[PDB]
Amino acid sequence: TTIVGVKFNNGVVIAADTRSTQGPIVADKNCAKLHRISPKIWCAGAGTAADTEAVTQLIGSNIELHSLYTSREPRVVSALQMLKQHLFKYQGHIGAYLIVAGVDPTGSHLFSIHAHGSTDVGYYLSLGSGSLAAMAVLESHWKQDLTKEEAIKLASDAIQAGIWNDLGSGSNVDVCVMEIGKDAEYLRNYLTPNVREEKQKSYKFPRGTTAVLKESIVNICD
Amino acid sequence: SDPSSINGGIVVAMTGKDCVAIACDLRLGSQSLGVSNKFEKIFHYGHVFLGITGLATDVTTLNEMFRYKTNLYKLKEERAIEPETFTQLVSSSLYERRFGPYFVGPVVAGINSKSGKPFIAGFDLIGCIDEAKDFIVSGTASDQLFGMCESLYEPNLEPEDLFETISQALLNAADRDALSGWGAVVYIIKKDEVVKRYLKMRQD
Amino acid sequence: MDIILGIRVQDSVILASSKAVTRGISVLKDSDDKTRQLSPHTLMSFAGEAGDTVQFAEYIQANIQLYSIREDYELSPQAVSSFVRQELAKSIRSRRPYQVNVLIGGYDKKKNKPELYQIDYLGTKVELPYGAHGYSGFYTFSLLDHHYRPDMTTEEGLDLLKLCVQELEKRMPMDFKGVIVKIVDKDGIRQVDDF
Amino acid sequence: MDIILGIRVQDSVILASSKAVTRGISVLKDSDDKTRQLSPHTLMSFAGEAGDTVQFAEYIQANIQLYSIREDYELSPQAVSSFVRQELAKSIRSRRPYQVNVLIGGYDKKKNKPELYQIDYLGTKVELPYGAHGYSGFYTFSLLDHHYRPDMTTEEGLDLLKLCVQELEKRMPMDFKGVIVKIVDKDGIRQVDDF
Amino acid sequence: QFNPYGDNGGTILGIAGEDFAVLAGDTRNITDYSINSRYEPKVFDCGDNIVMSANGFAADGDALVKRFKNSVKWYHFDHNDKKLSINSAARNIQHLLYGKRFFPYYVHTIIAGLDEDGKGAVYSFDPVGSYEREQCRAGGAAASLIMPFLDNQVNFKNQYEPGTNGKVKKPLKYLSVEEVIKLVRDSFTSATERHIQVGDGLEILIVTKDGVRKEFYELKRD
Amino acid sequence: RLKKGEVSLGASIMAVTFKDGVILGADSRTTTGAYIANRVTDKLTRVHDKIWCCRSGSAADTQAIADIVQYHLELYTSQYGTPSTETAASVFKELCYENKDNLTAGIIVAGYDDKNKGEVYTIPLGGSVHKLPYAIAGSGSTFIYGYCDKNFRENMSKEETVDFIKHSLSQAIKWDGSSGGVIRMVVLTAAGVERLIFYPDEYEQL
Amino acid sequence: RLKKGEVSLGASIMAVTFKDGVILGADSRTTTGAYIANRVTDKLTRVHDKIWCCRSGSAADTQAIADIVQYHLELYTSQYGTPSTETAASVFKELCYENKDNLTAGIIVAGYDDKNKGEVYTIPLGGSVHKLPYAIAGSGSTFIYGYCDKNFRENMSKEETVDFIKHSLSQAIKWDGSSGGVIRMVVLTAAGVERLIFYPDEYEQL
Amino acid sequence: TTTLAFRFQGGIIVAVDSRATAGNWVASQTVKKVIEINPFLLGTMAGGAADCQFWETWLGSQCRLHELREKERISVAAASKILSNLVYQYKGAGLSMGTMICGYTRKEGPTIYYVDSDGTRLKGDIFCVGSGQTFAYGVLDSNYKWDLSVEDALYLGKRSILAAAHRDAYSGGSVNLYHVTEDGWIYHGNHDVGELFWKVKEEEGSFNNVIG
Amino acid sequence: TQQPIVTGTSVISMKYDNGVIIAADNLGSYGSLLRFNGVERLIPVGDNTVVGISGDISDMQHIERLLKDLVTENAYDNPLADAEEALEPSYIFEYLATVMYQRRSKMNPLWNAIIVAGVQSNGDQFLRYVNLLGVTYSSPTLATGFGAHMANPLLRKVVDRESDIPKTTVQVAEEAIVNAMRVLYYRDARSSRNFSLAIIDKNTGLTFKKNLQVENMKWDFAKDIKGYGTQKI
Ligand SMILES: *[C@@](C)(CO)[C@](*)(O)[C@H](CC(C)C)NC(=O)[C@H](Cc1ccccc1)NC(=O)[C@H](CC(C)C)NC(=O)[C@H](CCc1ccccc1)NC(=O)CN1CCOCC1
Ligand SMILES: *[C@@](C)(CO)[C@](*)(O)[C@H](CC(C)C)NC(=O)[C@H](Cc1ccccc1)NC(=O)[C@H](CC(C)C)NC(=O)[C@H](CCc1ccccc1)NC(=O)CN1CCOCC1
Ligand SMILES: [Cl-]
Ligand SMILES: [Cl-]
Ligand SMILES: [Mg+2]
Ligand SMILES: [Mg+2]
Ligand SMILES: [Mg+2]
């Protein structure tokens, strides 16, 4: 994976590639690494794929119950605290590397969490195998007082650096913009710069090519 | 002593125009020794089909477990479980055993009875969902299946054409894997009819 | 413990199991019966780790016998095999698993059909026309692939079984001191005394 | 390679050696002669690591035959045994040692006495009334302690040897496919065809 | 402890026709999750209408090709400029490889050309020198993906004549240079999609009686 | 001791008592091997109003500990009023000592009482407690033992103590690859709490 | 890298160039584990009239090397005249580099030419050569990187350089258990060769 | 691999499969595991592919040099011993070879020698070598008689490989048949298991474990 | 079998329209200790080649001596040593590549990663990599160690393929290299601020720049960062 988070004027944006690997094999060419914890708190995940999904859903569930209990919109620090304490308790064995971002009554926030339960604060962050390629771009082009459109451009460019230069990352670029006072917009497949070219030949077989031994109707009804 | 490659086997699933296909080989062995040539790896709960590769004891255990759970589902819900919902149930159940997992590679396939949309999905051993428009592969010849599917597959295939594509994908992949083969079964699934065909393949 | 075989024919299931019990460089016994009757029409042979084998077999035997008394009814071979598989499937993830491999030969009285199930210590169940555990299979499976027919009689099955034992006695490294053969059919379980 | 025995009696030396050659779970051959004639009145049996055994035996055979041609004279069993021991004693401190154990049965024509030497792969030589290599000794030594007498005939020695083979066939784990027996006396070396 | 071997990734593919033979290979070079080069050729014209590629550990691959090219040169000097036949080259390569049986060249070697009857020939080698002439062979990282597709499309495996009850097999026939290049391009685009170590570019070397032609095609760079 | 692949807090941290109270100081570098995971980290952390600590070792371990200590001292305050710096160090020790096997946390505790003035307690890997006039810790501290011992004096002024910390950490940063970035400082006195920062362009050319 | 149980030369050694030439300095302690095998060792050793070296690492290895170098330079002198300090360092390097796996020798080479004045070459474990204004080495040198970097100046006087070495090694000794005893020094100038010694009672209370 | 060769009334039958594997990856289905040393000598190959191919083609060169020097075809014993002495020199180095040297000469008659990479050399009437040797033994031993006809012997050899090809995961592809007589070796074709299995199943009525 | 002791980090490089640029910092690390600071890791050979070396410094100094000796040996009995028969970048590289692979084959490697940058006699740009394993490759941009992970992505945005080389000027190319060196200083724990840079142009020749420093750094935003999550002060 490559995942990034970038703060701007009136909020925060996060982004991610869409490659899922199995050793050297690409298992999913278009998987979703951006996760909704609450309506306006989103999470980018790298590492063990099941762990990032499971831990984000569990905390997201408890955040919802907490929001209902307190009659308040949830805060990013609550998700941060709940995630880190959970991950710490499992001493790194739950391999989730997260970039947590969102807006709440306190303001806009951007954090990262590592598998062992350490958290970091920043204006720009990157995690995953292509974090070095992404951070190189972020360190080169980031500035204070970014606009919405400038932050999206910087974030996607940082993901692209991972897509092209890191073998662990590829395919498309997902984005989620979380602005203050507005609904969060999830931009699934914001960029698709890796479309498969037309095949040279159709491999549609003549009907009857495959040798068959038996046929039978299967009963699915009661 | 690698649980996922003791018994051997493969499963593949594909989508077509208003239809889905799911196929599997029949081999069960103990490393080099071929033991059974009747060991089917595809099961179904109502109209939802589940294929499972990997350690055979877990394949059997999980089939029995999901039959258990889907039966209680139907009694309480008063309706058959749908592929999208079943996919989530599989994922939950596998992740429940996160640090002592079932050594399996399951594959869901089916048509949603309400919307009519074709649906397929795959998982790793700890429950991570892998959804796909085109195809899902699993087993000891997964590399081979990935190669066959990626080249042979095209979208919106008719049920009769889709049968040929998935069958050729499975057969030629199995023939390049020592632990897969010994027969094969293909399920063609339309909205309200399901055909099951046994393939003739080389028996070595 | 080493050699256990099983052959399902037209009207019966035949189980053959080696008589030798060896510890170290000594054959301690040459007349060991590696089987237990689970019910009147169900027989289970076993092989594996010392102690585990008999302890497991008798534990299953007690449970099936308890069921028979409670319901005044005999469980089908398929039902017994499923019960046995689940016990082994539990076992493999225990602190100390049962290292036992079994064959279950039975006659289903409702279907009027013989049934042979092969289950390994992991809880891997398969129904087969012929089965074997351990190194035996590496010789007997190919042999039976050639000579076995589905419509054979019990006598034809015993000759087919003699052909397996001869091959094993010729090519196996260890002396397993012959086999005890038992037949399971519509009339129950009986032992062939001269083999 | 496994079982090699040797018994010295009044007027002859008798060597018995198993016929089985096993690799993995297969008995590849059941008629293997694990011995070489070093000279007309000297016979050496052998057992140990595959390949090493025959390579070593034939190498010794070539050397003793070379000596016989050069001097037009037959070396005494004691002299041959000493030569063999030294070769093994060199071998054990080589880059790759010969992992071969041998028995040397011979008839000394000058002394008119039979002689049996037991030499292991380390080069450990002992003259004995009866000898064995491998696990065989754990049964045969105690048996011979009881039944052996120094003034026995060749026929009495063969019956004593039959008693050893029977015990081994009863209590040994592996099937060694019987033995080839050979007698060494004043008239040279001959093989017993029916054992 | 020092490890003298490494994995440079990539994949290669050889197909033989009636009067021609092709040897293709991607131009990507990698170590771990990094890209070293997007264009580093590993299919070489070695003279005497023989093309060669040694895929795997590039240092060993280069060393081998270098030694074979040199073997061809000295064959001319020692045998009155005689043309080295493809079968003779194959046997010579076996001895190069087996010469290092106890410290092997970690490569899958494929050579292609024309035999002494003018017909297309492809030979393939294991790391220690075992070789075999074939109509078809894929080698390298994505060999397991491509090879079964070739069995199906080049040698018509598992394909029967429609309506013949799976009794009559699809008859074997030579493929045209046009049809072969279609299969090569489709094989590599498919492998690029699902294998992370395969991409960037495709270089094909075609061998006819007239000589050695080249063709290049772009591949996805993620 | 560090778990494989976990963020390393290897550091250049120090706390120095002086006439008006105590000053904590630290670098801002966090590493995963030789990659710098965060170049602008805050290793000085509040457990109470005027009781702070410097963190080194494992990022995860030190954070988890500091969060627990903050909880304990907040609960202490609700029942018994403001805790002493010694009390805070004791709570740190109890966690570090009782879990010495599972933790990698080299913590310096520093606080300001009105009675006891500025105090510094250092807690190394073992879980032992050592009350000192000043303390240094982290991977980069090895290189400045000589410098700090020769240059430290008791009852320094604020400006002198800031210069002492700045020069010391500058050297630690210069020689330790695991240390770098900005130099953060926190001043604890009767006046209140003051945060200071110093950038490379300034401290490198000292 | 040390062989098991072999004598350890872990040290506090340094060589410093200055206006009139160069000065070598060293502690006196040898250990096998925690036992001090020799407390009065001379770690400053002559390979030529005005080319000396400081030894650290393995006692046996450094001695064997120094003896070979002395032999080479004596033979060099008989044929080609006085060798440069660079030449001496090259001979040390050649031995240390070519036998890097079997040796543990951290050597500092220091000499005085008339043309090139005072020169210092340091040779760490790897066998690399580094020409520097001053150099520090040995187990105890870690503790004085900060101090020495802050306090070193080029073109110092003899008395200043002696004070710089004395204060530095004093701190290294104070913090390193593997260093101790007396502080030996050797002065290399145009005037000649001068040996100096400094005892604990003096340098400890600096 | 599965390879066999047995001696009988009408000479020697030699049968081999054609599969080559790298772990569970089926690398080839068309490998030639019988080497044709000369018109009267054959060699079978099991184990490491390169080791077998390289050293058995080398063996052929040594046999050619013998008949040039001695003006006479090499004996099966001498040919096998050249190979066994060679691998013995490499003992411990990790060669992996299970071979059978089969042929006819005047002085010896039909002869088979088993030679492997740990130095074992054995003369014998029947041998099966490879990962599927036991499967071949099961069928071969239970149907073997000395008085088999050339037609029946050829089939039994073919059927024994088929049996192993079926059960052994690391054997398959196709069957290569040879018959060795006093006049030399005779090739009896390549038989693909793809068609042969079903042909044998239907005609013989065997393989009832498989879904027909 | 070796283990590297005193080590040098990233070497980075790229092609531009008329030539090539190469750079490397002046640090000699001893594990985590940043021990030596005056280490030159770019070594010119003639007036048309620069060899940049990372990894073990003792082995680097050995390679220096070999190149130095190569120049001497080429001059022997060679009237055209400063003209047609001068040492080319391709000659120097192939020599090193031969040595590196021979040493790995003897299980006693020179523990380095090397980039030979230069301009050929016909004006063509030369840029090729070789390491301890004897592995070689060429690309419009090349980098070692971290540089491979962080510099290459940045340099490939300027020259992504062959056709981008004529379009890239020396001003644009140097700017990217200097920027990359800053990023490496931010993020590589075994890097220093001081570095050397070399340009080999087909027209203006060899320009060797020493004692450069990373500058125009962004550190101001650090002051706003407090705690690791909740903490407000
Ligand atoms: C980039 C692309 C790579 O780091 C991103 O980080 C993505 C993150 C997104 C997708 C969440 N990472 C992955 O894709 C991740 C990489 C990975 C692989 C293995 C271990 C850790 C990380 N991939 C996965 O997690 C895949 C998801 C599959 C494609 C659905 N899972 C696996 O590869 C599982 C790993 C299971 C696991 C067990 C114990 C600890 C950690 C992970 N592996 C397999 O399924 C392989 N094998 C197949 C046969 O059955 C046995 C298991
Ligand atoms: C039956 C078929 C199976 O055992 C027979 O035994 C045959 C005998 C025929 C081929 C002569 N044996 C094999 O197929 C043999 C099995 C084997 C493999 C490895 C060691 C011993 C025995 N297979 C091979 O020799 C394969 C043949 C290739 C596919 C043509 N070769 C390899 O596996 C090579 C080199 C092995 C090797 C031996 C000794 C030293 C070094 C290497 N290995 C690879 O190709 C590794 N790998 C393959 C997959 O892709 C990555 C590279
Ligand atoms: Cl932190
Ligand atoms: Cl000393
Ligand atoms: Mg098979
Ligand atoms: Mg990529
Ligand atoms: Mg001391």
Side-chain angles (χ1 to χ4, degrees), chain B residues 135-178:
Chain B
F135 56 83
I136 296 294
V137 302
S138 183
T140 48
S142 66
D143 286 18
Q144 289 89 323
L145 285 162
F146 269 124
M148 290 305 302
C149 292
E150 192 63 56
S151 41
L152 294 188
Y153 182 88
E154 47 180 292
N156 298 116
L157 284 163
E158 293 296 318
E160 292 86 349
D161 297 314
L162 179 66
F163 166 75
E164 298 297 331
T165 307
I166 191 163
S167 296
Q168 288 297 316
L170 185 145
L171 261 36
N172 293 282
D175 289 357
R176 280 285 171 180
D177 183 29

Side-chain angles (χ1 to χ4, degrees), chain G residues 71-137:
Chain G
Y71 160 77
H72 269 273
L73 297 179
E74 180 165 305
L75 184 56
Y76 184 100
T77 312
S78 294
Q79 301 185 63
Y80 324 120
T82 307
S84 61
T85 310
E86 192 179 29
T87 298
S90 179
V91 176
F92 269 110
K93 178 217 78 199
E94 211 75 16
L95 297 166
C96 295
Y97 176 71
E98 295 296 335
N99 299 294
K100 62 160 79 180
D101 300 335
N102 299 304
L103 294 172
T104 307
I107 292 164
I108 298 171
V109 186
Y112 180 82
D113 284 295
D114 208 297
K115 181 173 279 156
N116 301 290
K117 304 288 169 185
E119 282 184 342
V120 170
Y121 297 82
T122 187
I123 300 166
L125 266 51
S128 56
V129 202
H130 304 269
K131 189 183 184 294
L132 298 169
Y134 76 107
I136 54 166

Side-chain angles (χ1 to χ4, degrees), chain A residues 84 91 116 118-119 124 139, chain F residues 3 6 35 39 60 63-64:
Chain A
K84 69 142 64 177
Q91 293 288 311
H116 296 264
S118 64
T119 53
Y124 58 98
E139 289 281 46
Chain F
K3 280 159 208 184
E6 76 161 319
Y35 176 72
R39 65 184 174 97
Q63 284 180 16

Side-chain angles (χ1 to χ4, degrees), chain E residues 197-214:
Chain E
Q197 302 177 338
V198 179
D200 296 325
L202 171 58
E203 194 161 64
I204 308 167
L205 270 73
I206 310 97
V207 183
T208 60
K209 61 172 166 68
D210 292 7
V212 180
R213 188 173 76 266
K214 285 179 194 168

Side-chain angles (χ1 to χ4, degrees), chain E residues 168-187:
Chain E
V168 177
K169 300 173 73 175
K170 190 166 190 271
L172 300 172
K173 65 164 180 283
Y174 286 111
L175 284 80
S176 59
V177 68
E178 286 75 21
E179 271 288 326
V180 167
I181 290 169
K182 287 181 179 175
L183 292 168
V184 169
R185 286 186 69 178
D186 282 345
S187 292

